[PDB]
């Protein structure tokens, strides 16, 4: 009864910034639904970039200083939109981006570890060929 | 989802059937998600709508799981895909009057 | 430290903060029928918990080595990483449920080694 | 990090079988904080069993597992047509979380 | 052995989630005033004269006002209490036994009624946690958390649209609803000032009403719409308690349509509003689906003193999104008011344990 | 006996209490007020017993828990330790001294048990 | 089981009781007379438990407390100690014999614990 | 040491015999029906809604219906209850204070009376054991034993010769008396079928009466006499309750001489027997030695519905040993009916202990 939608198709110049979205239908707020952002090399495995738990702009040490996460919180007329900012899009930044909406209110059944939560649902997947 | 036929000027009933035999906070709506009617657990709240004097719910079937809507003096304008908001598995009923 | 007065990454200082709290584990027609029965039920439940506490194989606090082997399937802890810091909730109930599974196994094994040696030793 | 390595990569089986799917990991994880992501052909990955072997009421009981130290053999019994896919044992324990190698179930 | 053996803790503030029934905590005034239902007085458990509370430091604990489970027992206690309690002369329960309308006839005596505060105590263990932050949007986190053994001085009132004699919000009002601006959910706001309503008809003040409309309109703009005008509309429509407002007025329930109150246009860029009320003798029952009948009042002009604290109302729902916002009175669900009293808590319990996997190796 | 002697202080009280402790066991209608007193008495007695249970001696009439009754407090000659003991005003001061060593003693054995419990590590 | 066997005496009762003890947990309106019975039952149970607490064994189904079940009482062959045990008239005599050694045993371990507790010196 | 030291058990089904007073277990219907003695209702302890019972396997446990000690408390509870209870207007106690006949005069109100079931619960410990075999001759062993915490659904009735509304025997009837065919003891038999007696005079059925005489006559032959004829004789003689039969008939006690019932000749090798009953106003007291006096009945023709279950009667005692057996009605002692209700039990208690003398040698 809950479906996640990410941004569309985006092609950026080498050495630029990106702003992809993560719409979350049937979701209330990022305060209850923290979103962990994970990238994916096209065709390859998915590497966890970072997260926006409790409206906290952060990423991994491999992604620190290049990736910060904002998640515009809206509910009702508009679903919660989790954004993603990745600076200096080189040709190596050609990747498929991914978001994940999972509840943070439930705190005694099995959903999360130090921010890295159980990825229940996913969006569509945004293939971005930086050219 | 259910498709129901009809004619102008007919006492039609649109059921709102849930899975569990309980009376919950339901909301009857038009295609524009405008509040036709609902309940405060034990009252009949005819929400802000154009069919205020037309639509009417049955009291005795709420505990029986049904939160219907009875429309008197049916019209072509009264024909809409009415949204049966119950248990988040909405049996949005369709009405055809032409 | 305090009754939920810290927030950090997990596993050790909780053993240390609970160590400090446990070091100071003591913090040192008319009038009444309904409250007394609640006090009686509370002491019955507490004492029933205490006798079940008494039939255990560790009897020690915050540093205990009861006999079940937290095997390599469960053991991944580096030597110095065992005692550093620990808060973390959904993770905690799973950690706490893991704490109890080792507890029942541990005390059953020390009860089993105490009983096994009891039958076999025989320590003159 | 802790490099997960799902074993094997490809395997052949019929419908209605019981096959264990290993998952290498330098660290073991108490209670299996590794979610298996069955990426079926034509569908995004999904949650099969939260907590390795805990009971989930959204996925049928055909999926079961077992843990052997560095390896985590998901013993899926009664394989079906939808079971022919690429699972993904992902540790959601360390920071960051890593995928395995992937296991393809075919005819 | 050289392997890891784990430790045993004791007296720990660790916890495990609990799913149970709490009990009422209201003094046994049972023996002196009277046992005629004055709001907890049939056989309720007294209140601990020393309410316990321990603040939780640096605990970013979240709270949802929809998944409390403490809420779950309050309405059961209240319905059972109204049943043992103040009785209508007419009881109606339509049931298919299409259905067969059943009827139960009993006596309906009327007494001066006033809500009494009901604390909520838990059994051995079952730690309750009090959210004490400022910005609490119902389904939100809480920086300032403080566990309690029993709840605070909650003064609930079974009522319509605006909550009577209850708790207060945080610094203006607080939009605590499930959804803030969805045209599908009920707006759940509580007041911050006790709005005194004098009913003899009710002499509703105008300066306090304009101030509460102004504080709520600014909070709605802060929640949604930077440069927007929010205008108030008249009643939505429906039953007696829907268009008008039921409230404890000396035991009775006057019914003033709150349509002459909500017509204020606020701009982002005065003696007494005597509304016409109604003498209550036969109304739809709020407990379940049916009707009631009571005894005539002992007063022709009924005097009462009541402070109303809460704001639950309906909305048009058009778009009309940020051009102008329009809201209508109504609401006040029995299920939702029930959720609205106990909105900052949860229950967890524990046994004195916890580990550290060490190589301490002690005998036994 | 239960206050059946009168002599100079310190030892036979350890001996008379030793004998008493050797035989420490001496082996509309009916009631509401007396039961609550029995309940409060057993609650107080059991609360005293659990506090008794969290101690570092767990033994009777002769015990050596770990606090050093230091030379500032120690003046007892070797054979003078166990001879005879009754004496009241002196006793509450003696008994209060008994308790100060008790809390210190049990805190020290709890401290050595805990300290060794962290350090030993006894395979 | 709870009286689910019938055989010759002495050992499997230690074993069947061992299994039962291994799983020793099996895991105007409403009331005045029943509460007093529950209070008296817990007072009696707790009084029994504190008397249980002042004992010298504190162990279950295999215990060596200090009284010598002397040769006047000892006739048990080594392997004959643990085989099977039901038998009633014989049982109260056996059970009363069980209790006489119990009181003696715990008195002796209390005596050795107290005696050592007077003499040791375990620093 | 190398010598034998014995073990300490815990949670054992060992037991020790107990000699004490058990308490009544009958629901406190005290508050709703009435406290006018209806058979346990002055201050009796309620019944545990979940009766506990654990079957004992392969336990050849014997039982004597004469040395119960559970029996010892029932008549004391019943006499104390009849005293607090339904009162005669005349009380007589002849005592040498040759003796001085004393008299106590009080009121005698009459109410509809019906026996209520009284379970018998024990204090902490005091395990009760239920015999559940088929062939139980009172003073006999029991292969099928099942311990209980409280007794079964015992419905006792203080009565004469045939026990009213009680328990049942095993597959025909059961000869449970002290002696089976001694001409010195009272025959203690209970029925197996509830013999419905309709009293308006009592319309005693004839087919059921012939069947109960046939089942009892075959059981008497199985107990004594292979090829023998057993004929029934009329009443033995004595007081009103001796020749006739007292029984709870809507509170009253009709008195029909059971002499027209016992004249059946059975061979080893039919609408209604309306017996003449009597309106009860003055009878000898059954509690102790004396007489009573009550209030007149509210009905001229008194209707009641009663099922009688039991067979206690006298005998000629001639020899006449196996040639023919002749038995006469009578009996129904207060002391013996008292023994007849609680006939399959005994009370034992225990502390969690037991030994095995071993050489385990554990420290402490
Ligand atoms: C606060 O308020 C918001 C709305 O204002 C509520 O959010 C809605 O939640 C419901 C479910 O709870 C959402 O419904 C789901 O929508 C998914 C997306 O479909 C939309 O978008 C596509 C693409 O544009 C359109 O074609 C389509 O018509 C919809 O407009 C669906 O995929 C979901 O369907 C799933 O379940 C059904 C069940 O039958 C299956 O048949 C489907 O195959 C699928 O599995 C579902 O219908 C709705 O979209 C949400 N709206 C918004 C705006 O977010 C919140 O729930 C509310 N807060 C709370 C706590 O209730
Ligand atoms: C609180 O809530 C209630 C219900 O929502 C509001 O009631 C509405 O009040 C308006 C007036 O503001 C009503 O409009 C009036 O309708 C009258 C017709 O009543 C007759 O007909 C009905 C059937 O339709 C019968 O049931 C009834 O018994 C009567 O027989 C008109 O007579 C009124 O007109 C009067 O004023 C105009 C002013 O120009 C004059 O020209 C007329 O001559 C006449 O004097 C008026 O039109 C409306 O019907 C009510 N019900 C609704 C909307 O459902 C309360 O007003 C509200 N309280 C407030 C706003 O303070
Ligand atoms: C239930 O139990 C009682 C007591 O045991 C039985 O009572 C006996 O009944 C028999 C009849 O079956 C009685 O015998 C009758 O005696 C009468 C004499 O009564 C007078 O004398 C006595 C003193 O002896 C006075 O007290 C009394 O008031 C009377 O003044 C006779 O008159 C009877 O004879 C009648 O029948 C014969 C039949 O041939 C006629 O010829 C006569 O003319 C006359 O009509 C009869 O003999 C006996 O006395 C009673 N008491 C005993 C034995 O102690 C019940 O019968 C019994 N119920 C049964 C069997 O159903
Ligand atoms: C319900 O209430 C909770 C708390 O009561 C509330 O969560 C809070 O949300 C605000 C923002 O909505 C958070 O404030 C953030 O603080 C960080 C730290 O300084 C800032 O970096 C954030 O800025 C980010 O977001 C901007 C928005 O566009 C981005 O443009 C920018 O790039 C930044 O990345 C922001 O100011 C606050 O931390 C939380 N509090 C907690 C405890 O989580 C929640 O939003 C409320 N929900 C609703 C529906 O009202």
DSSP one-letter string for chain F: -TT-----SSSHHHHHHHHHHHTTT----S-HHHHHHHHHHHHHHHHHHHHHHT-S----SS---S----TTT----TGGGSS----HHHHHHHHHHHHHHHHHHHHHHHHHHHHHHHH----
Question: What per-residue string of b and e applies to G74-110 under the rule 16 or more CB within 10 Å gives b?
Answer: eebeeeebbebbbeeeebeebbebbeebbebbbbbbb
Taking an 8 Å cut-off on Cβ atoms, the answer to whether C123 and H359 are in contact is no
In angstroms, what CA-CA distances link E148 with E15, E348, H109, H317? Answer: 14, 11, 59, 82
Quote the DSSP letter at residue C102.
Answer: H
Alpha-carbon distance H122 to A76, whole Å? Answer: 64
Number of neighbouring beta carbons within 10 Å of residue E18: 18
Which pairing describes strands H324-328 and H229-232: parallel, antiparallel, or unpaired? parallel
- D38 CA to centre of ligand 2 in angstroms: 64
Largest CA distance in chain C: 65
Q: Name the token pair of B94.
A: 């369709």
Which residue's alpha carbon is at the smallest distance from atom 7 of ligand 2?
A: E257
Apex E145 CA angle, E141 and E149, nearest 5: 130
CB C109 within 8 A of CB C65: no
At residue D93, φ and ψ (nearest 5 deg) are -90, -65
In angstroms, what CA-CA distances link D77 with C30, D36, D50, D63, H313? Answer: 68, 15, 17, 6, 73
Q: What is the resolution of this structure in A?
A: 8.9
Q: Which helix (H) or strand (E) holds E17?
A: strand E16-17
**Which H residues 31-50 touch G at CB under 8 Å?**
31, 43, 45-46
Task: Find the domain containing D44 and state its range.
Answer: 1-107
Q: Which helix (H) or strand (E) holds B94?
A: strand B93-97
Residue C96: partners with Cβ closer than 8 Å, 6 or more residues away? E14, E16, E353, E354
State the Rg of chain C over Cα.
Answer: 19
User: Whats the size of chain G, residue-wise?
Assistant: 123
Q: Name the token pair of E305.
A: 């003193």
Helices (H), H13-100: 71-84
Place of tokens 């060992």: H14
Rounded to the nearest 10 degrees, the angle between the axes of helix F32-53 and helix G32-53 is 30
- A8 CA to centre of ligand 3 in angstroms: 117
Partners of H232 in beta bridges: H327
- Residue G40 contacts C, CB cutoff 8 Å: no
Q: Which residue from D45, D51, D98 is facing A122, i.e. has the nearest CB? A: D45
Q: Name the token pair of B25.
A: 């906070």
Domains of chain A: 1-131 (2.60.40.10)
Place of tokens 């610094």: E171
Gaps in chain B following residue numbers (C to N > 2.5 A): none
Taking an 8 Å cut-off on Cβ atoms, the answer to whether E361 and F121 are in contact is yes
- Atom of ligand 3 lying closest to residue H275 CA: 61
Q: Name the token pair of D86.
A: 């690429």
In angstroms, what CA-CA distances link E222 with A32, A34, E176, E216, E228? Answer: 20, 23, 13, 10, 10
State the Rg of chain D over Cα.
Answer: 13
Q: Name the token pair of A71.
A: 């998640």
Apex E107 CA angle, E102 and E108, nearest 5: 105
At residue F51, φ and ψ (nearest 5 deg) are -65, -30
Alpha-carbon distance G52 to G46, whole Å? Answer: 9
Bond from prior residue into A105 cis (ω within 30 degrees of 0): no
SS3 content of chain D, % helix, strand, coil (to 5): 0, 35, 65
Which candidate, E87, E85, E235, E70, places its Cα nearest to that of E161?
A: E235
Q: In what order do the strands lie in the sheet with H145-148?
A: H16-17, H347-349, H127-131, H145-148, H53-56
- Is the Cα dihedral H54, H59, H65, H66 positive or negative? negative
Query: A122 to chain B nearest CA, in Å?
Result: 21
Taking an 8 Å cut-off on Cβ atoms, the answer to whether E184 and A31 are in contact is no
CB C90 within 8 A of CB A110: yes
Which candidate, E298, E91, E1, A97, places its Cα nearest to that of C68?
A: E1
Phi/psi zone of residue E251: left (φ > 0), alpha (ψ -120 to 50 degrees), beta? left
Query: E94 to chain B nearest CA, in Å?
Result: 5
Chain-centre distance of CA H9, in angstroms?
Answer: 40
Which residue's alpha carbon is at the smallest distance from atom 26 of ligand 4?
A: A70
Partners of E102 in beta bridges: E93
Partners of H166 in beta bridges: none
What experimental approach yielded this model?
Answer: cryo-EM
CATH of segment(s) E10-361: 2.170.40.20
Place of tokens 């989930």: D56
- Is the Cα dihedral H152, H155, H159, H164 positive or negative? negative
Q: What is the DSSP string of E254-316?
A: ----TTSS--PBP------EEE-----SS-B-SSSSSB---PPPS-SS--EEEEE--EEEEE-
> What torsion, rounded to 10 degrees, do the Cα atoms H315, H316, H318, H323 define?
-70
Under 8 Å CB pairs connecting chains G and H tally to 146
Q: Name the token pair of E246.
A: 């039921």
Residue H112: partners with Cβ closer than 8 Å, 6 or more residues away? H250, H251
Q: What is the DSSP string of A29-92?
A: -TTTS-BEEEEE-TTS-EEEEEE-TTS--EE-TTTTTTEE--EE---SSS--EE-EEE-S--GG
Residue H161 burial (CB < 10 Å; 0-12/13-18/19+)?
buried
At residue A58, φ and ψ (nearest 5 deg) are -155, 170
Chain C environment of H360 (Cβ under 8 Å):
118-119, 121-122
Place of tokens 């997947």: A125
Alpha-carbon distance A97 to D84, whole Å? Answer: 26
Taking an 8 Å cut-off on Cβ atoms, the answer to whether E237 and B44 are in contact is no
Alpha-carbon distance B64 to B45, whole Å? Answer: 19
F111-119: long-range contacts at Cβ-Cβ below 8 A with a sequence spacing of 24 or more?
F111/F66, F112/F66, F113/F56, F114/C23, F114/C61, F114/C62, F114/C63, F117/C60, F117/C61, F117/C62, F117/C63, F117/C64, F117/E360, F117/E362, F118/C63, F118/E360
- Is the Cα dihedral H211, H212, H216, H222 positive or negative? positive
Q: Name the token pair of E229.
A: 């005008």
Query: G63 to chain H nearest CA, in Å?
Result: 4
User: Domain containing D64 — which CATH number?
Assistant: 2.60.40.10
Residue F60 burial (CB < 10 Å; 0-12/13-18/19+)?
middle
- H302 CA to centre of ligand 3 in angstroms: 27
Chain A environment of C9 (Cβ under 8 Å):
114
Place of tokens 């209702």: H41
B19 CB within 6 A, ligand 1: no
Name the closest residue on chain A to residue E16, using Cα atoms.
Answer: A108
Rounded to the nearest 10 degrees, the angle between the axes of helix H334-341 and helix H71-84 is 120
In angstroms, what CA-CA distances link E185 with E72, E296, E333? Answer: 20, 38, 12
- Atom of ligand 2 lying closest to residue E275 CA: 61
CB A30 within 8 A of CB A80: yes
| Distance spanning both ends of chain C, measured CA to CA | 46
User: Whats the size of chain F, residue-wise?
Assistant: 123
Number of domain units in chain D: 1
Q: Name the token pair of G55.
A: 């004992």
Alpha-carbon distance F87 to F74, whole Å? Answer: 20
Alpha-carbon distance C4 to E12, whole Å? Answer: 10
- E264 CA to centre of ligand 2 in angstroms: 22
- Residue E11 contacts C, CB cutoff 8 Å: yes
Q: For chain B, give every domain's residue range.
A: 2-98
User: Whats the size of chain H, residue-wise?
Assistant: 364
Alpha-carbon distance G118 to F58, whole Å? Answer: 14
Quote the DSSP letter at residue G37.
Answer: H
Quote the DSSP letter at residue G81.
Answer: G
- Atom of ligand 2 lying closest to residue E257 CA: 1
Number of neighbouring beta carbons within 10 Å of residue E363: 10
- Atom of ligand 1 lying closest to residue E139 CA: 60
- Residue E223 contacts A, CB cutoff 8 Å: no
Apex H312 CA angle, H306 and H315, nearest 5: 140
State the Rg of chain A over Cα.
Answer: 14
- Is the Cα dihedral D94, D95, D97, D98 positive or negative? negative
CB H47 within 8 A of CB H120: no
Alpha-carbon distance G36 to G31, whole Å? Answer: 10
E138 CB within 6 A, ligand 1: no
Chain F environment of E352 (Cβ under 8 Å):
none
Residue A117: partners with Cβ closer than 8 Å, 6 or more residues away? A34, A36, A100, A102, A104, A111, D92
Place of tokens 């709605």: E220
Alpha-carbon distance H342 to H156, whole Å? Answer: 9
Rounded to the nearest 10 degrees, the angle between the axes of helix E71-84 and helix E334-341 is 120
Which candidate, E302, E299, E304, E296, places its Cα nearest to that of E109?
A: E296
Q: Which helix (H) or strand (E) holds C113?
A: helix C89-120
Query: D38 to chain C nearest CA, in Å?
Result: 23
Alpha-carbon distance E237 to A19, whole Å? Answer: 46
Which candidate, C98, C83, E17, places its Cα nearest to that of D32?
A: C98
Quote the DSSP letter at residue C12.
Answer: S
Which chains, if any, share at least 3 CB pairs under 8 A with chain B?
Answer: A, E
Which pairing describes strands D19-24 and D71-76: parallel, antiparallel, or unpaired? antiparallel
Alpha-carbon distance F15 to F85, whole Å? Answer: 9
Helices (H), chain H: 71-84, 207-223, 240-243, 334-341
- G94 CA to centre of ligand 1 in angstroms: 76
Alpha-carbon distance H90 to C114, whole Å? Answer: 74
Domain B2-98: CATH superfamily is Immunoglobulins (2.60.40.10)
Judging contact as 3 or more Cβ pairs under 8 Å, the answer for A and C is yes
Residue E108: partners with Cβ closer than 8 Å, 6 or more residues away? E86, E87, E88, E89, E293, E294, E295
Alpha-carbon distance A2 to H102, whole Å? Answer: 91
Apex H33 CA angle, H29 and H36, nearest 5: 90
CB H166 within 8 A of CB H155: yes
CB D44 within 8 A of CB D55: no
Place of tokens 């009643």: E235
- Atom of ligand 4 lying closest to residue E136 CA: 5
Q: Name the token pair of C74.
A: 């469960």
Question: Which ligand has an atom closest to residue H245 CA?
Answer: 3
Taking an 8 Å cut-off on Cβ atoms, the answer to whether A115 and D50 are in contact is no
A47 CB within 6 A, ligand 4: no
Alpha-carbon distance H168 to H175, whole Å? Answer: 12
Judging contact as 3 or more Cβ pairs under 8 Å, the answer for A and G is no
């Amino acid at each position: 009864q809950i479906h996640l939608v990410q941004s569309g198709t985006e092609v950026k110049k080498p050495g630029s910034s990106v702003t992809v979205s993560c719409k979350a239908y049937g979701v209330n707020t990022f305060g209850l639904y923290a979103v962990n952002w994970v990238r994916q090399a096209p065709g390859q495995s998915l590497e966890y970039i970072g997260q926006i738990w409790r409206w906290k702009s952060s990423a991994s040490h491999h992604f620190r200083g290049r990736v910060l996460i904002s998640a515009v919180d809206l509910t009702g007329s508009s679903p919660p939109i989790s954004s993603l900012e990745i600076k200096n899009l080189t040709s190596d930044d050609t990747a498929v981006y991914f978001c994940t909406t999972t509840s943070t209110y439930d705190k005694w059944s099995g959903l999360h570890h130090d921010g890295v939560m159980a990825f229940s649902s996913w969006g569509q997947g945004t293939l971005i060929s930086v050219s | 989802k259910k498709v129901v036929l009809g004619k102008k000027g007919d006492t039609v009933e649109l059921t709102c059937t849930a899975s569990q035999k309980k009376s919950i906070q339901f909301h009857w709506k038009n295609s524009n998600q405008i509040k036709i009617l609902g309940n405060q657990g034990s009252f009949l709240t005819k929400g802000p709508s154009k069919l205020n004097d037309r639509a009417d719910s049955r009291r005795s079937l709420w505990d029986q799981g049904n939160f219907p809507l009875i429309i008197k003096n049916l019209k072509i304008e009264d024909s809409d895909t009415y949204i049966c908001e119950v248990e988040d598995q909405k049996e949005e009923v369709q009405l055809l009057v032409f | 430290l305090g009754f939920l007065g810290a927030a950090g990454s997990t596993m050790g200082a909780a053993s240390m903060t609970l160590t400090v709290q446990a070091r100071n584990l003591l913090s040192g027609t008319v009038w009444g029928i309904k409250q007394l029965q609640a006090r009686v039920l509370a002491v019955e439940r507490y004492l029933r918990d205490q006798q079940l506490l008494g039939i255990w194989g560790c009897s020690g606090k915050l540093i205990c080595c009861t006999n079940v082997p937290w095997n390599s399937s469960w053991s991944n802890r580096n030597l110095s990483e065992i005692w550093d810091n620990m808060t973390w909730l959904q993770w905690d109930k799973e950690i706490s449920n893991y704490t109890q599974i080792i507890y029942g196994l541990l005390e059953e094994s020390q009860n089993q080694q105490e009983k096994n040696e009891q039958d076999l030793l025989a320590l003159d | 990090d802790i490099q997960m390595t799902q074993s094997p990569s490809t395997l052949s089986a019929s419908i209605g079988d019981t096959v264990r799917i290993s998952c290498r990991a330098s660290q073991s994880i108490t209670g299996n904080w590794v979610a298996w992501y069955q990426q079926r052909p034509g569908k995004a990955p999904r949650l099969l069993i939260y907590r390795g072997a805990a009971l989930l009421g959204g996925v049928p009981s055909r999926f079961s597992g077992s843990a052997a130290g560095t390896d985590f053999t998901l013993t899926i019994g009664n394989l079906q047509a939808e079971d022919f896919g690429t699972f993904y044992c992902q540790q959601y324990d360390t920071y960051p979380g890593t995928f395995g190698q992937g296991t393809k179930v075919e005819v | 052995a050289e392997n890891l053996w784990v430790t045993v803790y004791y007296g720990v503030p660790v916890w495990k989630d609990a799913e149970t029934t709490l009990f009422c905590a209201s003094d046994a005034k049972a023996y002196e005033t009277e046992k005629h239902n004055v709001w907890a007085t049939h056989a309720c458990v007294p209140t601990d004269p020393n309410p316990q509370e321990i603040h939780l430091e640096n605990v970013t604990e979240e709270f949802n006002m929809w998944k409390n489970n403490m809420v779950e027992q309050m309405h059961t206690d209240i319905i059972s209490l109204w049943d043992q309690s103040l009785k209508p002369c007419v009881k109606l329960t339509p049931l298919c036994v299409n259905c067969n309308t059943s009827a139960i006839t009993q006596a309906c005596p009327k007494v001066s009624f006033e809500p009494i505060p009901i604390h909520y105590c838990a059994p051995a263990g079952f730690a309750i946690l009090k959210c004490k932050d400022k910005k609490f949007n119902g389904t939100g986190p809480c920086p300032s958390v403080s566990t309690v053994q029993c709840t605070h001085g909650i003064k609930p009132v079974v009522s319509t649209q605006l909550l009577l004699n209850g708790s207060l919000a945080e610094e203006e009002v607080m939009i605590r609803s499930e959804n803030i601006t969805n045209n599908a959910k009920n707006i759940l706001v509580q007041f911050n000032t006790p709005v005194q309503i004098n009913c003899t008809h009710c002499n509703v003040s105008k300066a306090t009403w304009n101030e509460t409309l102004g504080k709520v309109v600014k909070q709605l703009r802060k929640h949604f719409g930077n440069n927007t005008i929010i205008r108030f509309a008249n009643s939505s429509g429906g039953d007696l308690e829907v268009t008008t407002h039921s409230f404890n007025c000396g035991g009775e329930f006057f019914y003033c349509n709150t349509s002459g109150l909500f017509n204020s246009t606020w701009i982002s860029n005065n003696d007494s509003i005597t509304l016409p009320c109604r003498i209550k003798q036969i109304i739809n029952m709020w407990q379940r689906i049916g009707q009631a009948m009571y005894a005539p009042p002992i007063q022709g002009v009924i005097r009462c003193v009541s402070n109303i604290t809460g704001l639950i109302l309906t909305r048009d729902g058009g778009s009309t999104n940020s051009t102008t916002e329009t809201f209508r009175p109504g609401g006040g669900d029995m299920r939702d008011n029930w959720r609205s009293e106990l909105y900052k808590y949860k229950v967890v319990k524990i046994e004195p344990l916890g580990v550290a996997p060490t190589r301490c190796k002690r005998r036994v």
